[PDB]
Design a protein that fits this description.
This is part of a larger assembly, with 12 protein chains of 10 kinds.
Chain E lengths: L1 H14 L4 E2 L2 E2 L12 H15 L1
Antiparallel strand pairs in E: 1-2
Chain G lengths: L5 H12 L3 H8 L8
Chain J lengths: L1 H39 L5 E3 L2 H4 L2 H5 L10 E7 L4 E7 L2 E15 L13 E13 L49 E5 L27 H8 L4 H6 L2 E2 L29 H24 L1
Parallel strand pairs in J: 1-2, 5-7
Antiparallel strand pairs in J: 2-4, 2-6, 3-4, 4-5
Helix pairs in contact in J: 1-6
Classes of the chains: A mainly alpha (56), B alpha+beta (147), C mainly alpha (149), D mainly alpha (122), E mainly alpha (53), F alpha/beta (175), G mainly alpha (36), J alpha/beta (289), K mainly alpha (329), L mainly alpha (57).
PDB class: electron transport
Keywords: Electron transport chain, supercomplex, membrane protein, Tetrahymena thermophila, electron transport
Entry title: Cryo-EM structure of Tetrahymena thermophila respiratory Megacomplex MC (IV2+I+III2+II)2
């Protein structure tokens, strides 16, 4: 389930950004490293479902 | 499918009934066969008549439902008799004529229902009611289709 | 030999393109020139006036539509063998019908009986019957449509 | 034999397969139950394959239907595959339902042959 | 560009701007009609043979 | 044809038409576009020029006003050559303006180039000189059935006028 | 070119979900008759 | 919907009429065959009334 | 509604996990004829082990 | 012009390929037939009894093609039913006649006196021989094939065999187990195939049979070893003088009179010659073009 | 039953044969016994239960240990021969889409556009099933011939035989490609197309991509051997074949070179953007994975062992779970 | 004339057919990240460059 959610999120992010649609849930430009919102969202999507499954 | 193909196999190609057949009956289990039922076969004529009438009713109802929309329209040379081709029962086109004075568009009988009217939308439907025959021509309320 | 080299360079060329995309920004500002009082952007080997980004996208869409429908809208004109054959068959049938009914009077026995009845609501036929042959067949087809299947 | 109650877990697919296999060749299962199980296993096979074939046949016609004729490839493929999936599921479900129902009946008969039901006293 | 060149040549041919080749200009371009005859002959022969048999 | 054969004849014709353009009903609107758009203009005004520019923004304009004093045959040949080629960007829709003011010249051009896919007369009261020169060409285009008259008020919504003119041009393009 | 674009797919899905609205409204719209 | 209900009711009626006649196959090993016979049954009078 | 709710999560992937036989944890006070069921359960557990 | 030349070239290429393939097949078949004749000259039949007869060694190893065209001296009891399959014997129309030979028996009757069941017979079908069309009424159902084997010398052998289960006792105390065995040596044959072009077509509904269907024969004769019989079916052979002069039908098989293969070297050579003639003619025609 | 049943019966009979196990039916066909135990209906059902996988294994053995029959190959590639048969022409068009003017005929530079151009002809002789006869005839050529030459030979020997056969039968594949790449329907059958090509270009054009075809055939043979073995290096072999996927695309582009359908010339084949080399890689790999070609004769020892193990598991399915092991038996 | 007009009414814009719509739908250009294309030094990093390259196509 976590892998399916992560894959769906990655594909949706890539496709929506290919048309410009980007959710600014995090900062558009992060502090320090200044990573893009897209990269930060990709990292968060990779990280979160594993943590949730681990907790449950 | 839901009426014949499934019933044909479910009634004549098995001996175990469906789970829906025994869920309500508290009786010992048994198998069913079609060679020892209705020796005086009144069920055969009943099934045949039911199937014929149901198919006829379904066709007539589909034709009536699809027969209110307007598929093609053409005002006459004097625009007195508008020739319109609607959907025929066999899926073809059927041509009729309507008198200019017959068609009209009027507010609904419940004035409070105006806001809930189909024509209120920009890409909706507008019904011209030929009052002579009490007929309806449902034109597509949109600019692209009209001349 | 050349295609083997090309296949070897396929991941190589793709990697080079990826490196170029990474090391290059999609911004050059080398297209828009103010031609006299008209702002024209480089369009292929020439210029094209730009009023809005939406306008430029619309012009591109129109050109793309022209290019995509170029071949199909260049359909063969005089490929009319089947249509001509259909027209000829219909004309031949109509001519045979007109020949078979060249010299028949309009009124029939019923029409004669129509002259000996009080049925003034029904009217006597007074026109040619060619245009409405097999209207009974049409009515039979209408009546059997809801009962055939 | 298995627990009975709303809170109890339903019989699993692997459990049903194991029960059918046990009823198929147990030396403690009567001949009538064995014949019933064999007849159930034999006839139930036709329904699923017939349903899958019906889906394959009907879905082909639906792929070339009037409106289905001039749709984009993705939508046309999806619409065409829609009937096939429905009919295949119907056939497989019918086969599984018949088999499992007759298996449960055979299990009840075998339990009766061994009096393995509480409050079932002759 | 290749499609543009091919389409330009085809457009010339269709609109009548036929090639001017050494003062010998093709002022007409058409095609003849060929009818399926071998299938008809085969059908007639097969029908005659079947009738005889 | 008899009133009973009309349905069968029309069905047969519609079925047979598919052999000429496959998916014609699936491309009827697209086939509404011309193949190599050739346009003849008539009219002269500010709003007229605005409408010409808007409708022919993607099209190439031919300055037939410049081609003045040349022989009819030479002018027709030059106009056809201008309208019988695609630009490097596959731009082939050519609109000749201020041409030809002579019905004979228009007939020669039509014989050369298989007829203009569009002929547009701007019925604008702000236009005062166009009808003074292209009356014969207008009459020839009316006889050919290609002249489309866009009646434009000197004052009003330019965008609405552009939409109406674009619809008229699209529906009135001749294959 | 570009194949399955999620924006295009969502636009098509939204158009499909707004398709039967007109026919439903026409079926549910009040007519001009009142048979008391 | 009425047609679907009618189909369900027909299936129920067929199943109900079937249980009144118990026809089952039994294997005679003397001739090494299995033959299908029919016999009556004894059940609840409440079940019969239902 | 607003108190501790008894849990409903349970094992769902073991063969005959609910088939419990009589033992010291069960006091062996089961049905008098449940010995056959217990033996069958034990044999099935041996099969699935 | 171009169409005719291309068609001629394609036809020539296809016919040349077919000719080469059938020529290689003919050479391989000639080698195989020479080897088969040389091996058949040996006359050393492997014994089929005991654990070998319960499951035949070819069936046991699933390597019938390995044991193909071998001499086997088998023990068994012949079944009454005889199956005739339409086939030409020495150019004369007739029927290949096959009869099952029950090689082993099994008795699971622990209550042998309480109930008298039928022994489960593990049997192998043997083609009793070939009969002419004119003698179709000559074949006797359950007819005697040959004299039975003599009584065993070992007094410990006058009982059911350890694996074969056959009791060669001239006076069996269990008269329900009394039996007279038979022993015969013959050659091996693989199961034939139903090929439309090979005229091996069986109208099973009409009782007309031209393709040797072991499964169909088993279904007809109710043989317990269905798959074992379907593995292969042996054509019984005799050591010369198979049927000299008598009303002996079916006539048995001799050393050089056994049924040759349908895909024989002669058939392969004929197909090769036809394809080669086609290829040569097509090449000559293409050259003429 | 006097006019309709005599014709309608075969359809229901065929439907039942497709929906029932005929062999099992045959077992129930003859009721009775002739003196051998185990001839009852229950015994027949007991035998038939394992007999399904038993007959499958016997058919596999006949495919491997016996000479080949084309129908069996057709039986192995039935999904590839009839239903997904037009996918072959679709893939051919997609490979040829790099030099086709389909972009001017409303076909996108993608699999969707390739299908739309293919579907623009319909679902008939000129549609998605156009050239299916030629495709089937090609399938009846090199694969059957090479498989006849090398029944159970090694990978290298199989590759050599396949190369020889593919070199032998190039023109048929070239003609099939030309018909599949002819979007305007300018070819009136295989014979007419062959006549026009012969009169127009010369015989040499029939094998414009024969070497690339041989190389791709070797790669596909390696991939098929890996897939049959199930080595878990089958994915590695798939990746390796995907590395060489440009060879098949180049061969397809060369096959239709400098013709009316293609707006480019043979030299222009060397000027194409490299992005065109991976045009239909995804559809080709998907077809080669889902609707794969299977030559059961050329299956590896690992493949045979895996099949035998599956059959052994299926046979082991017939056992009593709660069976009690007694001290005396 | 009916064949020329495809039996479709002249002076009627009509609705473009589904394929045509798809022809319009699949022809539009891809919309890459404009912000990633900005001249900001924050976009000049390697991670931002890779994101722009993968996102702007």
């Amino acid at each position: 389930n976590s892998l399916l959610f992560t894959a769906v999120s990655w594909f949706s992010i890539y496709q929506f950004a290919r048309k410009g649609a980007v959710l600014p849930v995090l900062r558009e430009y992060g502090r320090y490293f200044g990573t893009h919102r897209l990269f930060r969202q990709y990292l968060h999507t990779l990280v979160l479902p594993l943590l949730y499954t681990e907790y449950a | 499918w839901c009426a014949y193909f499934v019933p044909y196999n479910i009634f004549f190609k098995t001996h175990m009934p469906l789970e829906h057949a025994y869920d309500n009956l508290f009786f010992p289990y048994f198998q069913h066969t079609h060679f020892l039922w209705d020796n005086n076969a009144l069920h055969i004529p009943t099934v045949g008549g039911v199937a014929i009438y149901a198919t006829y009713i379904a066709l007539s109802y589909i034709n009536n439902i699809w027969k209110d929309y307007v598929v093609r329209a053409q005002f006459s040379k004097d625009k007195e008799l508008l020739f319109v081709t609607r959907v025929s029962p066999f899926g073809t086109t059927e041509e009729e004529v309507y008198e200019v004075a017959h068609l009209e568009h009027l507010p609904p009988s419940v004035r409070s229902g105006v806001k809930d009217l189909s024509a209120q939308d920009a890409d909706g439907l507008v019904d011209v009611t030929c009052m002579s025959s009490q007929r309806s021509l449902v034109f597509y309320k949109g600019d692209q289709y009209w001349n | 030999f050349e295609s083997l080299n090309t296949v070897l360079m396929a991941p190589i060329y793709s990697f080079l393109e990826f490196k170029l995309k990474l090391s290059s920004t999609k911004i050059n500002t080398n297209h828009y020139y103010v031609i006299n009082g008209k702002l024209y952007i480089t369009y292929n080997d020439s210029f094209k006036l730009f009023t809005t980004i939406n306008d430029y996208f619309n012009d591109l869409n129109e050109l793309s539509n022209t290019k995509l429908f170029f071949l199909y809208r260049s359909f063969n004109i005089y490929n009319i063998k089947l249509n001509s054959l259909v027209d000829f068959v219909f004309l031949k049938l109509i001519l045979f019908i007109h020949l078979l009914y060249l010299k028949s009077t309009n009124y029939n026995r019923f029409d004669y009986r129509l002259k000996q009845t009080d049925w003034g609501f029904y009217i006597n036929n007074n026109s040619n019957y060619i245009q409405n042959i097999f209207s009974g067949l049409k009515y039979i087809w209408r009546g059997l449509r809801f009962w055939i299947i | 034999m298995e627990p009975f109650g709303t809170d109890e877990r339903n019989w699993t697919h692997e459990e049903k397969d194991i029960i059918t296999r046990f009823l198929k060749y147990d030396k403690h299962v009567n001949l009538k139950t064995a014949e019933m199980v064999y007849s159930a296993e034999v006839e139930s096979a036709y329904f699923g394959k017939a349903g899958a074939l019906a889906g394959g046949v009907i879905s082909a016609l639906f792929f070339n239907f009037p409106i289905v004729r001039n749709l984009p490839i993705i939508r046309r493929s999806v619409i065409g595959v829609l009937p096939f999936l429905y009919c295949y599921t119907w056939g497989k479900n019918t086969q599984e339902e018949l088999r499992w129902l007759k298996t449960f009946a055979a299990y009840q008969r075998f339990v009766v042959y061994h009096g393995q039901h509480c409050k079932l006293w002759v | 560009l290749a499609f543009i060149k091919e389409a330009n040549e085809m457009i010339q041919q269709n609109t009548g701007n036929l090639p001017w080749d050494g003062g010998k200009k093709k002022i007409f371009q058409g095609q003849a009609n060929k009818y399926l005859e071998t299938p008809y002959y085969l059908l007639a022969a097969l029908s005659g043979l079947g009738l005889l048999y | 044809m008899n009133n009973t054969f009309k349905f069968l004849h029309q069905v047969i014709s519609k079925l047979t038409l598919k052999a000429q353009v496959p998916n014609y009903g699936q491309y009827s609107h697209s086939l509404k576009r011309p193949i190599n758009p050739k346009v003849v203009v008539f009219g002269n005004s500010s709003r007229a020029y605005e409408l010409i520019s808007s409708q022919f923004r993607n099209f190439n304009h031919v300055n037939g006003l410049e081609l003045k004093g040349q022989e009819d045959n030479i002018q027709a040949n030059k106009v056809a050559q201008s309208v019988l080629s695609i630009n490097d960007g596959f731009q082939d829709g050519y609109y000749i303006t201020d041409f030809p003011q002579n019905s004979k010249q228009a007939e020669r051009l039509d014989l050369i180039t298989d007829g203009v896919n569009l002929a547009l007369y701007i019925k604008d009261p702000s236009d005062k000189v166009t009808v003074t020169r292209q009356q014969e060409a207008i009459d020839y285009y009316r006889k050919t059935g290609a002249l489309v008259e866009f009646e434009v008020d000197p004052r009003g919504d330019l965008e609405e006028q552009v939409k109406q003119l674009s619809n008229q041009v699209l529906n009135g393009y001749k294959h | 070119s570009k194949g399955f674009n999620l924006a295009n797919a969502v636009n098509t899905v939204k158009s499909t979900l707004n398709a039967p609205i007109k026919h439903i409204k026409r079926n549910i719209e009040p007519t001009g008759s009142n048979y008391s | 919907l009425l047609l679907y209900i009618l189909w369900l009711e027909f299936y129920q009626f067929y199943h109900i009429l079937s249980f009144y006649g118990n026809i089952n196959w039994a294997f005679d090993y003397d001739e090494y065959i299995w033959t299908l016979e029919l016999d009556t049954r004894r059940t609840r009078l409440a079940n019969n009334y239902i | 509604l607003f108190d501790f709710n008894p849990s409903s999560i349970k094992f769902e992937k073991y063969p005959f996990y609910y088939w419990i036989n009589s033992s010291q944890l069960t006091e062996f006070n089961q049905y008098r004829k449940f010995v056959i069921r217990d033996s069958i359960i034990y044999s099935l557990n041996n099969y699935i082990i | 012009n171009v169409t005719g030349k291309v068609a001629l070239a394609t036809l020539g290429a296809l016919t040349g390929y077919g000719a080469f393939y059938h020529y290689n097949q003919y050479l391989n078949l000639s080698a195989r037939w020479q080897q088969i004749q040389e091996n058949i000259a040996k006359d050393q039949p492997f014994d089929v009894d005991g654990f070998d007869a319960k499951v035949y060694p070819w069936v046991r190893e699933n390597n019938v093609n390995d044991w193909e065209y071998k001499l086997v001296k088998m023990r068994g009891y012949f079944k009454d039913q005889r199956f005739f399959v339409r086939r030409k014997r020495d150019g004369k129309e007739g029927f290949l006649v096959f009869a099952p030979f029950v090689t082993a028996v099994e008795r699971v009757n622990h209550r042998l006196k309480q109930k008298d069941l039928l022994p489960v017979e593990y049997s192998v079908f043997v083609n009793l021989g070939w009969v002419p069309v004119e003698n179709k009424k000559d074949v006797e159902l359950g007819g005697e094939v040959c004299p039975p084997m003599d009584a065993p010398t070992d007094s410990t052998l006058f009982v059911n065999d350890t694996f074969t289960g056959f009791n060669p006792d001239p006076a069996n105390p269990e008269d329900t187990e009394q039996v007279t065995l038979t022993e015969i040596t013959g050659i091996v044959r693989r199961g034939e195939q139903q090929d439309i072009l090979a005229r091996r077509r069986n109208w099973n509904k009409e009782g007309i049979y031209n393709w040797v269907d072991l499964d169909y024969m088993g279904k007809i004769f109710r043989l317990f070893n269905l798959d074992a019989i379907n593995t292969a079916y042996i054509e019984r052979v005799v050591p010369s003088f198979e049927e000299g002069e008598e009303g002996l039908y079916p006539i048995p098989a001799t050393k050089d009179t056994f049924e040759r293969p349908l895909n024989t070297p002669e058939r392969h050579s004929t197909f090769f010659n036809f394809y080669a003639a086609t290829s040569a003619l097509s090449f000559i025609s293409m050259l003429l073009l | 039953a006097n006019f309709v049943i005599p014709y309608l019966k075969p359809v229901a009979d065929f439907w039942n044969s497709l929906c029932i196990d005929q062999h099992q039916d045959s077992l129930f066909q003859f009721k009775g016994q002739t003196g051998s135990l185990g001839t009852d209906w229950t015994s027949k059902y007991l035998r038939s239960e394992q007999d399904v996988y038993n007959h499958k294994y016997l058919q596999y053995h006949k495919r491997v240990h016996e000479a080949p029959e084309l129908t069996d190959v057709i039986s192995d590639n039935v999904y590839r021969l009839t239903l997904f048969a037009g996918v072959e022409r679709v893939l051919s068009v997609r490979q040829a889409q790099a030099i086709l003017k389909t972009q001017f005929a409303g076909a996108t530079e993608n699999i969707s556009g390739a299908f739309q151009t293919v579907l623009n002809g319909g679902i008939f002789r000129r549609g998605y099933f156009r050239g299916a006869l030629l495709n089937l005839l090609q399938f009846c050529g090199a694969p059957y011939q090479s498989l006849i030459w090398s029944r159970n030979s090694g990978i290298t020997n199989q590759v050599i035989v396949s190369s020889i056969f593919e070199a032998f039968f190039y023109p048929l594949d070239t003609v099939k490609t030309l018909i599949y790449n002819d979007v305007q329907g300018k070819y009136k059958g295989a014979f007419h197309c062959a006549s026009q090509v012969v009169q127009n270009a010369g015989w040499s054009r029939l094998y414009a991509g024969i070497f690339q075809k041989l190389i791709f055939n070797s790669a596909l043979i390696f991939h098929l051997n890996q897939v049959w073995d199930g080595s878990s290096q089958q994915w590695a072999s798939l990746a390796l074949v995907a590395a060489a996927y440009p060879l098949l695309v180049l061969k397809t582009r060369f096959q239709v070179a400098g013709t009316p359908l293609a707006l480019a010339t043979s030299n222009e084949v060397l000027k194409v953007n490299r992005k065109t080399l991976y045009a239909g890689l995804v559809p080709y790999l998907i077809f080669n994975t889902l609707f794969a070609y299977e030559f059961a004769a050329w299956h590896s020892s690992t493949a045979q062992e895996r099949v035998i193990g599956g059959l052994q598991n299926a046979m082991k399915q017939f056992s009593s779970p709660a069976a009690e092991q007694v001290w005396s038996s | 004339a009916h064949r020329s007009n495809l039996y479709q009414s002249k002076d009627i814009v009509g609705e473009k057919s589904f394929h045509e719509k798809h022809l319009e739908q699949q022809t539009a250009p891809y919309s890459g990240v404009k912000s990633l294309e900005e001249p900001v030094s924050q976009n000049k990093s390697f991670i931002n460059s890779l994101m722009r390259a993968i996102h702007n196509h």
